[PDB]
Symmetry: D2
């Protein structure tokens, strides 16, 4: 199966797989059962921003999520990603719905990785502030589409703009990303994305994640709903 | 056949296909017969740097090449690249040898493209200061290799470091690049590369080019030597 | 007197100093009498974006201005800025009102300059997306203030948000900028700013400019109104 | 007195002020007595590179120093810089000599700071790869000079290139830097510098530091030698 490191914006509390009893941000290392969570005061129908940062010296994966006019939520976990992920990865966004539903709309996405050797810099940077119908530098999986209102819709939305249940979709950047190299003295990455989660319901589900995977990662069988398009089971 | 826009560092004067009688830098629009050239005081065995710049407002493709302690050469050509190239391209480096030969060593390569809409920025940036044996974000073609002394060797070099004749090789960045979009008010790109051209001979050949192509571009049949791995003939 | 190169967003047609009979974008080289203009379909009360680009190889100063959902305006002028400006400059935003008035609100401002030598890069980059009451890396002149609603108000606005007539203000980045150096083979810069020009009147005035000056530039005596805080007279 | 946070490359072991018995890298928070050190296998006459990173989420100041063909040294310290430094700072390089001496030559220096609000980015970036005789965007203090061989010489060097004892010099970037803002959800910075420490002696002294200070910081009285141009005493 795939190797997954993700930051989840988990909109629906599944208390039998260890979610707390509230919407939360979480760090997921090879399991949907977050190694660390924080309470997230999710706002239905508001555009929010998530930031993810890591470096190989500190070996600490950190995330912050906010909305305009509101306090942030943050979570951190000590993990050496060179012990979890392979040397070459792909980076992506995932989202799902289940019997409860929401839009999983991405308005922008940026990513920077840097490898500094002892010679000196290798870097990759992309920024999307709008998505075209045919966005050739993204690999879309499952129900993900680009170009509606210039956005990335990770899960299915109707003609009328209503979100659909039982949906899963992902978008990965086309180029592999180099996160370890034998002469690297510092490796770092940052990601940002802006999202709009809207639901007609009092109980939206299931969430959006930023993830890093093996380069050939695909949507696991039956990873709708609580598994966020990332994991085949709740182990 | 492929669509090619390139900047050539042409080490060998082929006067029957319009080269001037000296090493030169040139702008190549769909032909090895440069639309514009300038004299280049090429230095055998010295590391040099080339810079390429363009934007959609000015519609002028410009290049500068230099060595430390020496004067630069520069060439410019007015061309609307949205009339020559498709909306999605790949970017790359090419080099060849013929019956005359040289190393076509790349020590670093960087590229930045920006699309500014009326909404606002879409960007791609990569930087390579060293190349690994298995450089998964490059597409190598022909004789190109990575990882010898951490460099990109575009054409064949022997165990002893001697350049081989009748060689052609290219490297393209893995992700397609978006150089036109319908809401773009400004599109721009810049490229830089550092190169080491060495020959045991008084007459090195054939040269290195930075190029932009259709995304599915491949080395044309019989494009060794004067055709620089870019063109199928000298039309 | 100061040396000024500017891009003007000129909201009020002063036909006796050569303005065309409509709001316009213009390139100003040492004179309020633009060397080049283009028609600008200015939108009272809409946030717009201006982009300015130049490089020393092409020697062409270009600008684009747009609003969301609208066509752009663009202007270009061939000028070697190394023949007009000194080696060290400051960069800034200016605005004025006269007997006719408008807000001259800046919501964001970014600037990048690069000097590439034959050795290789020297760079400066700043980005402001919000302005604090005490913004220590800006030099405010005249009526300019920071921190109201997190914006830069270049000209006077009342408690109620009404723009005031006979006002002039500028903001310059604190650090001098190096735009020529003797070993530079390419020098370039880009600027972006987002602005909100609002007036209760059918005839707003006078405009906003992005400018480059001698480092010790100050507001000329009596440069309210048609002189945009840039020039002492209409020569 | 000034407020100082620094990363020291300490070439001379002063064991009575807590230095270990070897050249070392250290994190200095308001004291020359490092809060944390690591062994540094300093190489007389070799160009080396230092990297410094921090962010407000992790609150961990980390540094790495290396030379080509050698293993790195690294040091980290948990510190909330918003509790140590004011909201506006200057950033700089310092160096000293005493009765033992060395060159304190800077070949390049780069710095990036980012403030991400809940609205979204404020950024400053500079890069120097060469220094001119009159480098107007640096504040030079004490014996520091620019433009000899295009380098920054932090301490005195003779006509012949011999380093002088009893010397102290600093260079600060001209613009103040904003490292805390009330709406910032993430603040980060990175610095890089390349240095050449050369001595005719078996015992070079005293070292180079990257530092962050109050904006009006100056060289303390009698801060030659072991105090690195940073501190007035060894408290
Ligand atoms: Ca859940
Ligand atoms: Ca030729
Ligand atoms: Ca006017
Ligand atoms: Ca010491
Ligand atoms: Mn969860
Ligand atoms: Mn030619
Ligand atoms: Mn005008
Ligand atoms: Mn020490």
């Amino acid at each position: 199966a795939d190797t997954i490191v993700a930051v989840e914006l988990d909109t629906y509390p599944n208390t039998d797989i260890g979610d707390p009893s509230y919407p939360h941000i979480g760090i997921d290392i090879k399991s949907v059962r977050s190694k660390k969570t924080a309470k997230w005061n999710m706002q239905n129908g508001k555009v929010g921003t998530a930031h993810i940062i890591y470096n190989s010296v500190d070996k600490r994966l950190s995330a912050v999520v906010s909305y305009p006019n509101a306090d942030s939520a943050t979570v951190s976990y000590d993990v050496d990603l060179d012990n979890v992920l392979p040397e070459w990865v792909r980076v992506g966004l995932s989202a799902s719905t289940g019997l409860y539903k929401e839009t999983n709309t991405i308005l922008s996405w940026s990513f920077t990785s840097k490898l500094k050797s002892n010679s000196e810099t290798n870097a990759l940077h992309f920024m999307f502030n709008q998505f075209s119908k045919d966005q050739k530098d993204l690999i879309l999986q499952g129900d993900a589409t680009t170009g509606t209102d210039g956005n990335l819709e990770l899960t299915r939305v109707s003609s009328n703009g209503s979100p659909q249940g039982s949906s899963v979709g992902r978008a990965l950047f086309y180029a592999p990303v180099h996160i370890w190299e034998s002469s690297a003295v510092v490796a770092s990455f940052e990601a940002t994305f802006t999202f709009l989660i809207k639901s007609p319901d009092s109980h939206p589900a299931d969430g959006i994640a930023f993830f890093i995977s093996n380069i050939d990662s695909s949507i696991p069988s039956g990873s709708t709903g609580r598994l966020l398009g990332l994991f085949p089971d709740a182990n």
